[PDB]
Amino acid sequence: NVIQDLYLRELKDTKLAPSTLQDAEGNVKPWNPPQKPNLPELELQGPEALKAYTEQNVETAH
Amino acid sequence: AKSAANKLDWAKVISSLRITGSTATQLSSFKKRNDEARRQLLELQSQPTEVDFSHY
Amino acid sequence: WVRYEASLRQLEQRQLAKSVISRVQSELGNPKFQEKVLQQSISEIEQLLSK
Amino acid sequence: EVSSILEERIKGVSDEANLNETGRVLAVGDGIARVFGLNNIQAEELVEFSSGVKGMALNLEPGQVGIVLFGSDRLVKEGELVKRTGNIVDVPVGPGLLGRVVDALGNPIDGKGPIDAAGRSRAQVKAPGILPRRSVHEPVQTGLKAVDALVPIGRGQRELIIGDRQTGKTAVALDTILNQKRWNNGSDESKKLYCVYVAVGQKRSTVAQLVQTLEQHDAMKYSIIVAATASEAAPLQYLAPFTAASIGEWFRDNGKHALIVYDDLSKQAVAYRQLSLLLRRPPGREAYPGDVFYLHSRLLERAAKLSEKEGSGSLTALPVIETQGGDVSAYIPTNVISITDGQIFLEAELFYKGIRPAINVGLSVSRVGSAAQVKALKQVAGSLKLFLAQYREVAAFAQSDLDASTKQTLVRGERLTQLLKQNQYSPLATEEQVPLIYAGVNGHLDGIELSRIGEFESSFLSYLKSNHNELLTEIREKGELSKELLASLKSATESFVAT
C-alpha cells in the first residue's frame, strides 16, 4: 500500500553513481609492489679480515 | 641444533671464567646470541606469506 | 581497500536515505494520500472480517 | 546491492495484525508513564509505545499500569498509544553475538547489520541450584604474575576486582582477555572461554578506544562487547548487566566455558539509585535503595561453574567495583564484597608509586581460588604469598637496624616486588610465568642486583628457550613440575644466573 508507493518511488528514482577507483585510492592505502632490499654483504669477508685475524690473533688481552 | 651451540657456549662461559681472557669473548658471545635470538623472534614472528584471497 | 568499500556502501545508503525522505514528502502531497485511505479502508474491512 | 538489501527490507514490511494493544499515556515525565488500559498484561512485559520506544511494565495497579520508559522521555508524550509487545523482556542470545559490539537493545552498534542469534531469553533468569554446581577445577590465566600466583583465579567464580577509578581500571581485565587469546584461539573448546566485556557508564569515545584496542589485538572474534554508555539512559543501564548475563548463560548452557567482566557494577548502583528515586521508592544507606543488595546478588549468582549434568559450563564473573576514595566500608562495596568470592583490591597508592599493576596483597583474597591452580603453579608458587607477607611484615617494622635474617628477607622481598610488575597492556604467557616464579622462590633472584631485574626476566626467558625450550614444552604439557624437571630447572636457572 504505502509500501508500494514508497517502494516504487524510492527504488525507481534512486540511481547509484559512486566514486571512481581513482577517487577511492585517496581514501585507502595504495598497493605496494615487492620491496627488494637486495642482499647485504657482511664483514668477515675480504682479505681485510684475514690479515687482521693473523695479526690480531697473535696477541690478545686478559 | 641451536641448543647444542648454546650448551657448549655457556659451558665455555663458566670455563672461560677459570682462565685468562674475556676482552672480546663476551662481544662474540653477545653477537651470536643476538642474531640467534633475533632469528628466534623472527621464527615466531613469521606468518604465512600469501594473501588469503579466498575470503578477501 | 575493503574498509573504504564498506564506507562507500554506507555512504550510498545514507544518500538513498535522504532520497527516501524526499519520496515521502512527495507521497504525502498526492491525493493518493486521500485515495489510499480507501485502500486502507477496504483492507481493514477484509482484515477485520478475517478476525 | 545496497538497492537489493533495501528492497528486501521494504518487502519485509507486510501488514499489521489486530490484538490487544493500546493503552493511553496520561501522566508522563519523570521517566515513568501512567497508562490507561493494558487490562491483561504479563508482569514485566516489554511494551512498545507508538512513540517508537519501549518500556518495561513495572507496576500493575488496579486500573492503571505504570510503564518505565526504557529509553528517552523526549519522544514520549501524553495521550500516546502504548502497544503491548506481549512478551516479557527477552534479548537475542546465540553464538553469532561473538565479535559483535551491540548496545543494550541488542542493536548492532558495530553496525555489521543484524546479529545472528539462536534464541532470545528472558532478562531475569534464576541462578542454578546447589545440585547443578560442580566445584571449580579449571583455572583462568590472566598472564600477569601474582594475579595468577598470589591471586589464584578459577572458572565459574565471582572473583571481585575492586579498586579506584581510572587507575587504568579497565586494563587489568583487558590483559586477562588478551592472555586467554592463546587458549581461546586454541582448538580445545574446554580451553575456550568466550569472554564478554560489559561496558556500562563509560564514554562512548573511551569504548571506541577499547574496541579499537581489541581489534588491534584481533581479540574481537572471541569476545562480545555490550555497551551502555554514560550518555545512554539509566533504565537501559539498569537492564544492561542482566541482559549481558543472559547472553553469557547461552554459552554456559552450551556447557562451554565462558567469562563475563562486568565493568563497572558501581555505576549500575547509581543507575538503580536513579531509577528507584524516580519511582519514589524510599532510599537506603548512602541513598542507595534497599533492594540494591537484591539487585547485585541476583545478578552475581547467575555466574557459576555448573555440574557435569549441565555439561560443566562456566561463566566466570569478574565484577569491577569503583571505590570513591578507597572507601572499603562503603555500603555498595561491602555489599558486593559479601556476595563475591575473594577480592582483588588494587593498591592505588602503590599504583601511583610506580607499581603497575598494583595489587594490595593483603586486601586480595580468593575464597576457593587456590584449588583452581595447576600443580606447577602450586608447587612453584608455594608459600610465596607467605614470603611476601613476611616482606609485608619486614617492611612494616623496617621503618632502624636490620638483623641479617630480616635484611635477607628485605633484599629478596624488594626484588620480588619488582619482579611482580608488568608492562600495562602486554601480558606474559602462562608457560613463562612458571620459571619466573621458580627463580625467585628457589632463591636464584636473591643475588640478582635490583637494577638488572628487568634484564634478568627477559634474558632468563630467552635463555630458557634458546638453551632448552624442551623444558618449557614439558612443563607446558605436564603442568606439574616433576622432581627431574625441578632439578633440571634448578640447574638451568642457576646456569642463567651465572650469565
XYZ file of C-alpha atoms in Angstrom:
668
model
C 0.000 0.000 0.000
C 2.179 2.765 1.441
C 4.822 0.078 0.962
C 4.122 0.040 -2.756
C 4.145 3.832 -3.248
C 7.320 4.307 -1.280
C 8.928 1.249 -2.872
C 8.166 2.362 -6.378
C 9.156 5.970 -5.960
C 12.300 5.337 -3.949
C 13.711 2.424 -5.902
C 12.961 3.727 -9.355
C 14.124 7.253 -8.880
C 17.296 6.400 -6.965
C 20.258 5.878 -9.228
C 23.571 4.754 -7.785
C 26.664 6.517 -9.127
C 29.570 6.339 -6.639
C 33.213 7.470 -6.663
C 35.723 6.047 -9.147
C 38.549 3.679 -8.159
C 40.914 6.597 -8.687
C 38.876 8.674 -6.216
C 38.711 5.655 -3.870
C 42.503 5.326 -3.823
C 42.965 8.537 -1.811
C 40.722 7.153 0.899
C 42.730 3.911 1.185
C 46.348 2.802 1.392
C 47.520 2.073 -2.178
C 49.027 -1.197 -3.455
C 52.633 -1.881 -2.585
C 54.829 -3.730 -5.092
C 57.775 -6.013 -3.998
C 60.273 -4.342 -1.616
C 63.548 -5.831 -2.948
C 66.028 -4.835 -0.173
C 68.933 -6.511 -2.089
C 71.386 -8.862 -0.366
C 73.587 -7.069 2.218
C 77.265 -8.058 2.149
C 78.744 -8.590 5.568
C 82.059 -8.114 7.351
C 84.429 -11.038 7.992
C 84.642 -11.146 4.258
C 87.574 -9.972 2.169
C 91.286 -10.257 2.976
C 90.809 -7.260 5.299
C 89.639 -9.875 7.773
C 92.405 -12.400 7.057
C 95.396 -10.103 7.673
C 93.556 -8.667 10.651
C 92.955 -12.159 12.091
C 96.558 -13.338 11.675
C 97.906 -10.192 13.337
C 95.118 -9.691 15.902
C 95.191 -13.356 16.765
C 98.869 -13.144 17.586
C 98.191 -11.284 20.869
C 95.046 -10.857 22.945
C 94.419 -9.249 26.321
C 93.204 -10.829 29.543
C 70.562 -27.796 16.912
C 70.983 -24.255 18.210
C 70.698 -25.733 21.718
C 73.948 -27.686 21.110
C 75.708 -24.456 20.225
C 74.413 -22.809 23.379
C 75.207 -25.747 25.664
C 78.815 -25.674 24.582
C 78.793 -21.849 24.736
C 77.591 -21.485 28.325
C 79.807 -24.360 29.442
C 82.604 -22.364 27.868
C 81.480 -19.110 29.574
C 81.906 -20.653 33.009
C 85.120 -22.319 31.789
C 86.438 -19.004 30.459
C 85.830 -17.714 33.948
C 88.591 -20.119 35.029
C 91.212 -18.958 32.530
C 92.591 -15.584 31.496
C 90.886 -13.656 28.667
C 87.381 -12.248 28.255
C 88.162 -8.940 26.485
C 86.365 -9.724 23.229
C 84.885 -13.107 24.182
C 81.758 -11.509 25.614
C 81.291 -9.412 22.495
C 81.439 -12.556 20.351
C 79.003 -14.351 22.663
C 76.756 -11.308 22.600
C 76.785 -11.269 18.800
C 75.960 -14.929 18.200
C 73.297 -14.786 20.881
C 71.930 -11.534 19.473
C 71.262 -12.732 15.956
C 70.233 -16.197 17.160
C 67.646 -14.574 19.434
C 66.669 -12.218 16.602
C 66.075 -15.274 14.440
C 64.019 -16.899 17.162
C 61.803 -13.842 17.347
C 61.698 -13.961 13.550
C 60.712 -17.586 13.533
C 57.879 -16.869 15.946
C 57.055 -13.632 14.066
C 56.564 -15.413 10.759
C 53.021 -15.553 9.487
C 52.250 -17.257 6.150
C 53.495 -15.489 3.079
C 50.409 -15.197 0.916
C 47.347 -13.029 0.696
C 44.297 -15.043 1.711
C 42.259 -14.064 -1.322
C 39.941 -16.974 -0.575
C 37.832 -14.658 1.550
C 39.453 -11.356 0.709
C 40.502 -1.294 0.273
C 37.821 -3.446 1.931
C 37.282 -0.785 4.596
C 36.611 2.048 2.158
C 34.418 -0.279 0.118
C 32.200 -0.765 3.159
C 32.307 3.002 3.721
C 31.075 3.643 0.183
C 28.153 1.285 0.731
C 27.226 3.154 3.915
C 27.524 6.491 2.095
C 25.286 5.161 -0.686
C 22.787 4.011 1.893
C 22.583 7.405 3.614
C 22.274 9.087 0.214
C 19.387 6.783 -0.608
C 18.065 7.528 2.881
C 17.626 11.226 2.136
C 16.082 10.194 -1.162
C 13.509 8.137 0.803
C 12.647 11.275 2.777
C 12.221 13.172 -0.470
C 9.911 10.453 -1.769
C 7.838 10.560 1.453
C 7.247 14.305 1.130
C 6.110 13.685 -2.433
C 3.730 10.894 -1.421
C 2.025 12.993 1.222
C 1.380 15.731 -1.341
C -0.586 13.499 -3.688
C -4.336 12.882 -3.283
C -3.044 9.316 -3.241
C -2.922 10.483 0.377
C -6.709 10.612 0.062
C -7.227 7.726 -2.340
C -5.108 5.278 -0.351
C -7.269 5.833 2.718
C -9.905 3.985 0.693
C -7.354 1.225 0.088
C -6.623 1.002 3.804
C -10.346 1.056 4.489
C -11.128 -1.918 2.284
C -8.020 -3.690 3.537
C -9.181 -3.238 7.089
C -12.615 -4.451 6.057
C -11.007 -7.610 4.736
C -8.642 -7.884 7.665
C -11.080 -7.383 10.476
C -13.537 -9.732 8.832
C -10.683 -12.234 8.769
C -10.644 -11.740 12.533
C 23.485 -4.297 -3.761
C 22.505 -1.526 -1.373
C 19.389 -1.332 -3.520
C 18.772 -5.066 -3.219
C 19.198 -5.118 0.568
C 16.876 -2.136 0.954
C 14.368 -3.726 -1.402
C 14.423 -6.965 0.563
C 13.782 -4.938 3.677
C 10.890 -2.972 2.114
C 9.351 -6.251 1.008
C 9.657 -7.421 4.602
C 7.132 -4.780 5.641
C 3.815 -6.569 5.237
C 0.627 -5.913 7.208
C -0.267 -5.297 10.862
C -2.391 -7.655 12.919
C -5.153 -6.933 15.380
C -4.566 -7.854 19.006
C -4.686 -6.399 22.471
C -2.687 -3.253 22.269
C -3.312 0.340 23.154
C -3.139 1.985 26.464
C -3.177 5.744 26.568
C -0.471 7.711 28.228
C -1.558 10.215 30.864
C 0.899 11.429 33.439
C 4.275 11.107 31.919
C 7.671 12.524 32.583
C 9.975 11.549 35.421
C 10.731 8.576 33.139
C 7.577 6.721 34.007
C 4.287 6.968 32.303
C 0.934 6.014 33.653
C -1.070 4.347 31.024
C -4.769 3.713 30.983
C -5.930 0.279 29.912
C -3.488 -2.553 29.119
C -6.016 -4.655 31.020
C -4.360 -8.002 30.542
C -0.647 -7.557 30.601
C 2.009 -10.062 31.684
C 4.164 -8.746 34.520
C 7.479 -7.202 33.467
C 6.339 -7.175 29.866
C 8.072 -5.206 27.186
C 5.640 -2.689 25.758
C 6.454 -0.648 22.717
C 4.938 2.810 22.669
C 3.837 4.396 19.424
C 6.382 6.976 20.423
C 8.676 4.331 18.931
C 10.368 3.433 22.169
C 9.871 0.554 24.537
C 9.425 0.308 28.253
C 9.074 -2.395 30.835
C 5.822 -2.504 32.765
C 6.727 -2.343 36.437
C 3.654 -1.563 38.470
C 0.458 -3.342 37.621
C -2.065 -1.478 39.661
C -5.856 -1.572 39.802
C -6.981 0.449 36.778
C -3.574 1.730 35.724
C -0.244 0.376 34.675
C 2.944 2.302 35.187
C 5.415 1.653 32.426
C 9.055 2.570 32.969
C 10.478 4.036 29.829
C 13.486 2.090 28.631
C 14.669 4.972 26.529
C 14.289 8.721 26.130
C 11.327 10.610 27.518
C 11.729 13.221 24.790
C 9.664 11.333 22.250
C 7.089 10.028 24.732
C 4.149 12.330 25.375
C 0.664 12.405 26.854
C -2.191 10.527 25.197
C 0.052 8.334 23.107
C -0.930 4.828 22.301
C 1.078 2.187 24.039
C 1.037 -1.130 22.307
C 1.751 -4.355 24.089
C 4.720 -6.320 22.762
C 3.007 -9.066 24.702
C 6.237 -10.663 25.784
C 8.413 -10.490 28.870
C 11.726 -8.756 28.328
C 13.965 -11.099 26.376
C 17.092 -10.309 24.420
C 18.516 -12.327 21.499
C 21.094 -14.907 22.671
C 23.075 -17.223 20.426
C 26.501 -17.891 19.008
C 26.646 -15.115 16.440
C 26.893 -12.359 19.017
C 30.597 -13.304 19.152
C 32.717 -10.467 17.837
C 29.846 -8.037 17.541
C 29.560 -4.851 19.547
C 25.884 -4.419 20.429
C 24.046 -1.965 22.634
C 21.514 -2.884 25.305
C 18.638 -3.275 22.858
C 20.924 -5.675 21.017
C 21.113 -3.218 18.154
C 24.415 -3.799 16.330
C 26.417 -0.699 17.246
C 29.261 -2.358 15.399
C 26.766 -1.751 12.587
C 27.607 -5.023 10.916
C 23.869 -5.403 10.383
C 21.522 -7.910 12.002
C 23.051 -10.205 14.582
C 22.795 -13.979 14.198
C 21.244 -15.240 17.404
C 19.849 -18.678 18.141
C 17.102 -17.633 20.546
C 16.021 -14.840 22.791
C 15.989 -15.398 26.535
C 14.345 -13.582 29.431
C 16.432 -10.843 31.027
C 15.947 -12.146 34.540
C 16.676 -15.814 34.997
C 17.253 -17.510 38.339
C 20.662 -18.904 39.251
C 21.190 -22.715 39.076
C 20.620 -24.738 42.255
C 23.057 -26.492 44.554
C 22.737 -29.693 42.575
C 23.854 -28.068 39.313
C 27.148 -26.694 40.540
C 30.455 -28.548 40.393
C 33.425 -27.217 42.323
C 35.990 -25.346 40.254
C 38.919 -27.153 38.732
C 39.936 -25.255 35.635
C 41.899 -22.038 36.113
C 41.598 -18.754 34.312
C 45.050 -17.427 33.497
C 45.485 -13.691 33.258
C 49.126 -13.837 32.157
C 50.097 -11.429 34.906
C 52.242 -12.751 37.699
C 50.707 -12.523 41.148
C 47.335 -12.149 39.502
C 47.555 -15.873 38.949
C 50.033 -16.708 41.639
C 49.193 -14.627 44.696
C 45.651 -14.297 43.461
C 44.576 -17.669 42.121
C 41.594 -17.300 39.744
C 39.411 -20.158 38.517
C 36.407 -20.692 36.315
C 32.805 -20.015 37.370
C 33.834 -17.989 40.437
C 32.572 -14.498 41.145
C 36.012 -13.088 41.704
C 35.760 -9.439 42.652
C 38.022 -6.788 41.254
C 37.759 -3.742 43.440
C 39.900 -0.622 43.322
C 39.827 3.086 42.491
C 38.633 4.816 39.344
C 40.685 5.179 36.192
C 43.790 3.565 37.648
C 43.751 2.046 34.180
C 40.902 0.187 35.779
C 39.909 -1.487 32.576
C 43.461 -2.651 31.871
C 43.593 -5.452 34.438
C 40.640 -7.098 32.766
C 41.823 -6.377 29.235
C 45.031 -8.191 29.991
C 43.031 -11.233 31.093
C 41.153 -11.282 27.789
C 44.433 -10.929 25.951
C 46.235 -13.761 27.767
C 43.338 -16.032 27.056
C 43.696 -15.174 23.373
C 46.221 -18.005 23.332
C 43.874 -20.571 24.781
C 40.723 -19.178 23.167
C 42.349 -19.226 19.762
C 43.110 -22.822 20.760
C 41.262 -25.785 19.250
C 40.161 -27.272 22.573
C 36.748 -25.901 23.476
C 37.362 -26.927 27.062
C 40.146 -24.370 26.738
C 37.791 -21.847 25.125
C 36.400 -19.100 27.259
C 34.057 -16.872 25.359
C 34.582 -13.655 27.166
C 32.020 -10.865 27.398
C 33.057 -7.324 28.228
C 30.191 -5.330 29.623
C 30.909 -1.639 29.299
C 28.469 0.325 31.397
C 28.677 4.028 32.066
C 31.813 4.745 30.092
C 32.292 7.416 27.476
C 31.409 6.190 24.025
C 34.767 7.564 22.928
C 36.521 5.507 25.590
C 34.630 2.408 24.480
C 35.708 3.170 20.927
C 39.315 3.207 22.087
C 38.684 -0.126 23.815
C 37.082 -1.553 20.705
C 39.973 -0.361 18.615
C 42.491 -1.899 21.021
C 40.603 -5.185 20.997
C 40.527 -5.226 17.224
C 44.225 -4.331 17.234
C 44.941 -7.399 19.283
C 42.480 -9.190 16.947
C 40.640 -10.280 20.036
C 37.259 -9.174 18.828
C 36.499 -12.506 17.253
C 36.302 -14.409 20.571
C 34.614 -11.671 22.570
C 31.331 -9.744 22.653
C 31.093 -6.161 23.828
C 27.795 -4.925 25.188
C 27.637 -1.165 25.610
C 25.506 1.070 27.755
C 27.486 4.283 27.775
C 27.233 7.108 30.300
C 25.030 9.127 27.968
C 22.757 6.103 27.393
C 19.626 6.163 29.527
C 19.586 4.987 33.121
C 16.804 2.369 32.771
C 18.769 0.904 29.857
C 21.821 0.940 32.130
C 19.811 -0.847 34.803
C 18.941 -3.668 32.455
C 22.406 -3.719 30.917
C 24.214 -6.237 33.160
C 21.211 -8.515 33.329
C 20.946 -8.726 29.547
C 24.642 -9.401 29.166
C 24.459 -12.253 31.600
C 21.666 -13.847 29.587
C 23.941 -13.957 26.570
C 26.646 -15.431 28.761
C 24.302 -18.066 30.002
C 23.667 -19.293 26.459
C 27.367 -20.215 26.207
C 27.265 -21.615 29.732
C 24.182 -23.597 28.872
C 26.024 -24.901 25.842
C 28.203 -26.325 28.641
C 31.009 -24.272 27.172
C 33.366 -22.319 29.353
C 32.871 -18.577 29.340
C 33.714 -15.493 31.343
C 31.976 -12.161 31.821
C 33.553 -8.998 33.153
C 31.031 -6.505 34.423
C 32.573 -3.058 34.122
C 31.522 -1.288 36.396
C 28.770 -2.540 38.692
C 29.204 0.513 40.889
C 27.760 2.564 38.056
C 24.803 0.176 37.952
C 24.204 1.114 41.573
C 23.999 4.790 40.719
C 21.624 3.909 37.908
C 19.414 1.771 40.100
C 19.501 4.594 42.631
C 18.315 6.998 39.988
C 15.595 4.644 38.858
C 14.421 3.936 42.395
C 14.284 7.604 43.294
C 12.341 8.354 40.148
C 9.944 5.608 41.231
C 9.979 7.437 44.569
C 10.663 4.249 46.485
C 12.387 5.120 49.809
C 16.221 5.400 49.715
C 18.580 3.248 51.755
C 22.036 3.838 53.193
C 24.107 6.268 51.148
C 20.847 6.922 49.319
C 21.197 3.636 47.503
C 17.842 1.812 47.687
C 17.245 -1.162 49.946
C 16.820 -3.554 47.053
C 20.320 -2.722 45.884
C 21.530 -5.855 47.670
C 18.914 -7.886 45.807
C 19.931 -6.260 42.539
C 23.575 -7.178 42.827
C 23.015 -10.573 44.384
C 20.545 -11.753 41.776
C 22.962 -10.619 39.086
C 26.082 -12.120 40.568
C 24.909 -15.608 41.429
C 23.993 -16.341 37.823
C 27.725 -16.787 37.273
C 28.745 -20.290 38.136
C 30.644 -23.474 37.365
C 27.860 -25.949 36.742
C 27.942 -29.692 37.163
C 28.500 -32.477 34.647
C 24.724 -32.730 34.209
C 24.665 -29.204 32.847
C 27.739 -30.061 30.755
C 30.128 -28.393 33.177
C 29.620 -24.886 31.781
C 31.373 -21.934 33.323
C 30.539 -18.286 33.419
C 33.330 -16.721 35.416
C 32.326 -13.295 36.717
C 34.801 -10.505 37.242
C 32.874 -7.518 38.535
C 34.685 -4.237 38.614
C 33.984 -2.009 41.612
C 34.895 1.634 41.629
C 35.534 2.828 45.156
C 35.034 6.508 45.812
C 38.117 7.110 47.856
C 39.072 3.552 48.609
C 36.089 3.557 50.923
C 36.241 -0.105 51.756
C 33.487 0.197 54.333
C 31.202 1.962 51.823
C 27.784 0.384 51.522
C 27.956 -0.569 47.881
C 31.475 -2.010 48.119
C 30.803 -4.000 51.256
C 27.573 -5.376 49.827
C 29.431 -6.554 46.755
C 32.287 -7.995 48.793
C 29.905 -10.179 50.750
C 28.436 -11.661 47.606
C 31.716 -12.141 45.805
C 34.303 -14.843 46.218
C 37.559 -13.102 47.122
C 38.621 -9.538 46.473
C 41.255 -8.266 44.087
C 41.816 -4.934 45.757
C 44.322 -2.974 43.741
C 46.619 -0.725 45.743
C 46.136 2.774 44.371
C 48.955 4.311 46.394
C 51.416 1.805 45.013
C 49.910 2.250 41.551
C 50.749 5.938 41.670
C 54.031 4.999 43.284
C 55.108 3.067 40.208
C 53.855 -0.435 40.797
C 51.962 -1.330 37.700
C 49.944 -3.456 38.145
C 49.493 -2.810 41.857
C 47.756 -5.464 43.862
C 47.188 -4.960 47.570
C 48.176 -8.454 48.585
C 46.595 -8.037 51.988
C 43.291 -6.940 50.528
C 43.371 -9.573 47.822
C 41.804 -12.894 48.771
C 40.207 -15.647 46.688
C 37.739 -17.796 48.581
C 38.098 -21.016 46.616
C 40.687 -19.776 44.155
C 43.644 -21.941 45.098
C 42.261 -25.309 44.045
C 41.810 -23.957 40.545
C 45.591 -23.581 40.293
C 47.510 -26.152 38.290
C 50.108 -28.104 40.216
C 53.036 -26.330 38.574
C 51.642 -23.027 39.799
C 51.006 -24.527 43.215
C 54.441 -26.006 43.649
C 56.468 -23.137 42.211
C 54.320 -20.543 43.904
C 54.340 -22.479 47.166
C 54.485 -20.098 50.108
C 55.418 -17.057 48.012
C 52.363 -15.291 49.445
C 53.636 -16.014 52.935
C 57.118 -14.884 51.983
C 55.771 -11.618 50.644
C 53.590 -11.307 53.700
C 56.854 -11.652 55.536
C 58.102 -8.906 53.232
C 54.942 -7.083 54.250
C 55.852 -7.600 57.900
C 59.528 -6.842 57.329
C 58.950 -3.517 55.681
C 56.341 -2.744 58.349
C 58.958 -2.640 61.083
C 61.887 -1.704 58.829
C 60.715 1.831 59.434
C 66.015 1.118 62.092
C 68.774 -1.537 62.334
C 68.177 -4.730 60.360
C 69.211 -8.191 61.528
C 70.740 -10.321 58.786
C 67.665 -12.569 58.734
C 65.471 -9.502 58.309
C 67.835 -7.966 55.762
C 67.831 -11.131 53.689
C 64.054 -11.078 53.595
C 64.051 -7.393 52.708
C 66.553 -7.874 49.888
C 64.543 -10.729 48.491
C 61.237 -9.006 49.141
C 62.044 -5.730 47.453
C 63.441 -7.554 44.482
C 60.478 -9.931 44.331
C 58.091 -6.996 44.308
C 59.988 -5.616 41.303
C 59.501 -8.995 39.642
C 55.711 -8.862 40.089
C 55.352 -5.697 37.958
C 54.214 -5.962 34.326
C 54.011 -3.555 31.395
C 50.444 -2.299 31.045
C 48.617 -3.779 28.074
C 51.127 -6.525 27.390
C 50.602 -9.733 29.393
C 53.011 -12.670 29.592
C 52.309 -16.285 28.683
C 51.298 -18.825 31.339
C 54.236 -21.029 30.444
C 56.594 -18.097 31.030
C 55.208 -17.307 34.436
C 56.238 -20.704 35.768
C 60.042 -20.201 35.502
C 59.995 -16.633 36.707
C 58.264 -17.643 39.897
C 60.598 -20.622 40.091
C 63.631 -18.367 40.009
C 62.708 -16.116 42.871
C 61.201 -18.828 45.056
C 64.221 -21.071 44.630
C 66.250 -18.054 45.601
C 68.004 -17.525 42.317
C 66.863 -13.892 42.214
C 68.167 -13.366 45.763
C 71.567 -12.340 44.488
C 70.459 -10.511 41.328
C 71.094 -6.795 41.809
C 67.950 -4.684 41.843
C 68.868 -2.627 38.793
C 69.095 -5.643 36.487
C 65.809 -7.357 37.473
C 64.054 -6.336 34.257
C 67.002 -7.567 32.247
C 67.015 -10.802 34.233
C 63.452 -11.551 33.282
C 63.782 -11.111 29.545
C 67.205 -12.667 29.352
C 66.159 -15.581 31.553
C 63.214 -16.350 29.304
C 65.288 -16.001 26.142
C 67.932 -18.183 27.756
C 65.418 -20.848 28.659
C 64.036 -21.024 25.162
C 67.438 -20.987 23.487
C 69.088 -23.449 25.879
C 66.116 -25.755 26.079
C 62.589 -24.801 25.239
C 62.145 -28.564 25.701
C 61.840 -27.974 29.434
C 59.160 -25.378 28.867
C 57.324 -27.665 26.428
C 57.381 -30.368 29.087
C 56.059 -28.043 31.773
C 53.523 -26.867 29.186
C 52.075 -30.276 28.729
C 52.732 -31.924 32.067
C 51.521 -28.899 34.011
C 53.143 -30.452 37.047
C 56.778 -29.896 37.890
C 58.375 -33.331 38.251
C 61.367 -33.876 40.529
C 63.525 -34.287 37.460
C 62.096 -31.091 35.970
C 62.546 -29.316 39.274
C 66.179 -30.313 39.471
C 66.735 -29.612 35.774
C 65.144 -26.241 36.197
C 67.233 -25.543 39.307
C 70.320 -26.357 37.263
C 69.115 -24.396 34.243
C 68.101 -21.365 36.287
C 71.450 -21.395 38.058
C 73.026 -21.531 34.620
C 71.097 -18.401 33.608
C 72.056 -16.713 36.925
C 75.710 -17.203 36.032
C 75.127 -15.288 32.822
